[PDB]
């Protein structure tokens, strides 16, 4: 006799009961998708030497515009050894370090050649036409990054750019939050393996393949528990192995009442809700188990393939994101236009769709293909339509009206 | 002295000259991100048996509303053996097969119990109150999927849902396009490895780490060629290994003689363009090499870290997607509002930004973080701002105005 739980109450409960995982040390190359559990400080200055910005000559600003003798040329990767004396300048490139005695750089466009080297190549004398400002066209020491400066704060969700920053400052080892390990199992006597040919009264298990694929897309390690028969003994053994090997357990699939017995009496777990006022996803069940000061979470998803994947993105995905240290694990919701008229249901409705942006149209269009009359498009669904409950005024929604759409895939 | 190539001419050229890779056979579990090179047909009917839709009783429609004896119950995973005779009915569930002799199912809400069993629960007799329609509330054989029906078309970019569909129809082996292997190398005498401490006149290489991480995010296999010295001999040896091991070669920096020379004279490759009118990314170079009837492509990216990552998402990423068989490798572009006022440049400008959706605001906001050396946000950049070139009428854009933003990361 589980009470009808509102959508808001169920969603908040999941996030509230979902714990945050511990920390571990990883290499910076594997930092993709990881969340920093430490502050990152630079141990060196960037650049470590004064570098030119333009191609030209390193000059003394006090000398001003005049004729100068070229004592040599500075090249990238080599610290200059010559000292710039008054009346002299040094040839420089965009990446070359600034030689001693020079306080300014004049680009080549502001200079003209006076004299040839009597033979061969190289230039000895050049005329500077512009009065250089002190520090002109020079990247000073520590201009970009100073030593002791914090380059990355704790809680930063690292991407490709953040990885390169670690490489820049020379931090190859970082402390991050652990990734959640998720075990997925299927229940039902009518289920056979996808590799097997069909037998009378049997069908192939699709939930296990789909659920794993969804979690794997987000970069989480997974465990396959296989197909479990609908009996207390097999369920107990399956759940026990899942708890021992993984942090998160996901099951799929009347018939509803027998499963929770093992969770309540045998596993001593706390079931928070067993029914949610939503369409689809009615028999969704969520329970928690505290063992050795560590909390394990268990998701019991409906047997229906469509109901399973919808509830997975709504409840399981945000929970997993919270576990890996993401500060705001709540999914991204955008505005879009309906492609077709829809009748409203007393329950809040969710349905898979495809988001497409058109020519100079500010809002994207959502095409319903989730309904089954599967409409064969070359693209996979990247959004989840969020339809409002039936109201006193609204019983029907019209084409073009703005509705909420939850982004679930890479655009 | 290479002519200034427009962004459109450069972008289209890359896509046109980029070939499509061959095909291979893989397991359905590894089908994530793959593109089908074959049509997929179902070899079985779904469901393979007539199944009830509602919880109630499987009845004979010809009997009409009357008193019926309950002869038993059908369970999932078990083919029914009993035959429904006139004046008899059978208990059924939502997933149970329909027994022989029955042509309709009446839900429990339209029935009344006549007799309870004196002990041990169970149901003996029931009254039918409604005239049942022939075939009511029953899923016929092959209702969802018919034998010989095409479930997946060639060219389909498979996601989590498509994998589960393959498992349902029993297709465990499928033909898909190969994934491109990308080799990345860096050039420059001033470059050191990230793991090393700094030396006079030297800095750490950040481009290689960032570029690899970007390609890995899209799921493509990569090869690290390491750092190559700026000399004709080392470039030839590095490029030769890249061609031998990979289909795509990417170099970064050191543009401003040796690189373009070895490609033309020594490697006999075809350089298409060397300069592109864009900001940043001016010294971007793209070339193709045909050996043994196979086309290899080579990307030469600028030395600047920001210039490297920008050109990567604009040119390299769409090119990679075409090779794996994606029909439309063009990136997704959406509408967003500017967070700050900007002055327009004669060149088209691109710089990383953050897309955020606010409360019921139809358009997202784009926050400028592109002006590094640095806004420290807890979130990584997920968009690339696309600013238009300066015109006679438009010289400056104001906060709130609608601009195009290219999605480059998972939202």
């Amino acid at each position: 006799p589980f009470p009808l739980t509102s959508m808001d109450k169920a969603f908040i409960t999941v996030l509230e009961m979902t714990p945050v995982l511990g920390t571990e040390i990883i290499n910076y190359r594997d930092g993709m998708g990881r969340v920093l559990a430490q502050d990152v400080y630079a141990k060196d200055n960037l650049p470590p030497f004064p570098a030119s910005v333009k191609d030209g000559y390193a000059v003394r600003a006090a000398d001003g515009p005049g004729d100068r003798f070229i004592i040599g040329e500075s090249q990238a990767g080599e610290q200059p050894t010559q000292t710039v004396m008054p009346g002299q300048v040094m040839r420089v490139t965009t990446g070359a370090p600034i030689p001693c005695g020079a306080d300014a750089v004049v680009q080549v466009e502001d200079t003209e050649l006076i004299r040839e080297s009597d033979d061969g190549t190289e230039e000895l004398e050049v005329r500077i036409l512009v009065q250089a400002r002190p520090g002109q066209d020079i990247r000073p020491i520590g201009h970009d990054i100073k030593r002791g400066e914090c380059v990355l704060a704790k809680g930063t969700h690292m991407g490709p750019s953040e990885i390169g920053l670690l490489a820049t400052v020379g931090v190859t080892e970082v402390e991050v939050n652990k990734f959640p390990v998720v075990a997925v199992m299927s229940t039902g006597n009518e289920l056979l393996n996808p590799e097997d040919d069909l037998l009378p009264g049997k069908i192939r298990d699709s939930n296990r393949s789909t659920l794993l694929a969804t979690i794997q897309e987000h970069g989480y390690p997974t465990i396959n528990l296989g197909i479990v028969g609908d009996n207390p003994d097999d369920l107990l053994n399956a759940l026990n192995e899942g708890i021992s090997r993984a942090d998160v357990i996901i099951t799929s699939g009347g018939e509803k009442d027998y499963l929770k017995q093992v969770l309540d009496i045998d596993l001593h777990a706390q079931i928070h809700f067993g029914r949610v006022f939503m369409k689809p996803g009615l028999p969704t069940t969520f329970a928690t188990l505290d063992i050795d000061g560590v909390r394990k979470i268990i998701f019991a998803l409906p047997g229906n393939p469509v109901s399973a994947v919808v509830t997975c993105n709504l409840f399981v995905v945000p929970a997993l994101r919270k576990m890996q240290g993401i500060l705001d694990p709540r999914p991204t919701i955008i505005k879009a236009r309906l492609s077709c008229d829809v009748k409203l249901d007393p329950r809040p409705e969710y349905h898979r769709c495809i988001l497409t942006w058109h020519h100079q149209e500010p809002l994207p269009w959502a095409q319903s293909t989730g309904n089954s009359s599967r409409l064969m498009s070359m693209r996979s669904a990247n959004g989840l339509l969020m339809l409002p409950p039936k109201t006193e005024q609204y019983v029907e929604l019209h084409k073009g009206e703005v509705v909420d759409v939850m982004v679930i895939g890479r655009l | 002295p290479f002519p200034l190539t427009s962004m459109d001419k450069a972008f289209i050229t890359v896509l046109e000259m980029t070939p499509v890779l061959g095909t291979e056979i893989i397991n359905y579990r590894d089908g994530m991100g793959r593109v089908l090179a074959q049509d997929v047909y179902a070899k079985d009917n779904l469901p393979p048996f007539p199944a009830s839709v509602k919880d109630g009783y499987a009845v004979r429609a010809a009997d009409g509303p009357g008193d019926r004896f309950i002869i038993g119950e059908s369970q999932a995973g078990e083919q029914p053996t009993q035959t429904v005779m006139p004046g008899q009915v059978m208990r059924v569930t939502t997933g149970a097969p329909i027994p022989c002799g029955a042509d309709a199912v009446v839900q429990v809400e339209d029935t009344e119990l006549i007799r309870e069993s004196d002990d041990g629960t169970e149901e003996l007799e029931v009254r039918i109150l409604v005239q049942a329609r022939p075939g009511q509330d029953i899923r016929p054989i092959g209702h969802d999927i018919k034998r010989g029906e095409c479930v997946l078309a060639k060219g389909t970019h498979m996601g989590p849902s498509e994998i589960g569909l393959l498992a349902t129809v029993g297709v465990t082996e499928v033909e898909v396009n190969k994934f491109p292997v990308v080799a990345v190398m860096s050039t420059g005498n001033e470059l050191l490895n990230p793991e090393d401490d700094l030396l006079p006149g030297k800095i750490r290489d950040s481009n290689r780490s960032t570029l690899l991480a970007t390609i890995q995010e899209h799921g493509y296999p990569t090869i690290n060629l390491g750092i190559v010295g700026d000399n004709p001999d080392d470039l030839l040896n590095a490029l030769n290994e890249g061609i031998s091991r990979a289909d795509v070669i990417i170099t970064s920096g050191g543009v401003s003689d040796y690189l373009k020379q070895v490609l033309d004279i020594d490697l006999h490759a075809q350089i298409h363009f060397g300069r592109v009118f864009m900001k940043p990314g001016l010294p971007t170079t793209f070339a193709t090499l045909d050996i043994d009837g196979v086309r290899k492509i080579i990307f030469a990216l600028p030395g600047n870290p920001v210039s490297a990552v920008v050109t990567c998402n604009l040119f390299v990423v769409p090119a990679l997607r075409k090779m794996q068989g994606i029909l439309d490798p063009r990136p997704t572009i959406i509408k967003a509002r500017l967070s700050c006022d900007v002055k327009l440049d004669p060149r088209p400008e691109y710089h990383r930004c953050i897309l955020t959706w606010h409360h019921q605001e139809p358009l997202p906001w784009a926050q400028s973080t592109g002006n590094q050396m640095r806004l420290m946000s807890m979130r990584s950049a997920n968009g690339l701002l696309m600013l238009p070139p300066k015109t006679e009428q438009y010289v400056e854009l104001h906060k709130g105005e609608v601009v195009d933003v290219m999605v480059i990361g998972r939202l």
């Binding site: 959508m7 808001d8 969603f11 709540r330 919701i333 809040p348 409705e349 969020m386 339809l387 409002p388 409950p389 609204y394 929604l397 009206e401 703005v402 509705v403 909420d404 | 409360h359 019921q360």
Partner: peptide, 8 residues
């Protein structure tokens, strides 16, 4: 922002 769908 709320999980429940809204309209205007």
């Amino acid at each position: 922002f709320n999980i429940v769908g809204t309209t205007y």
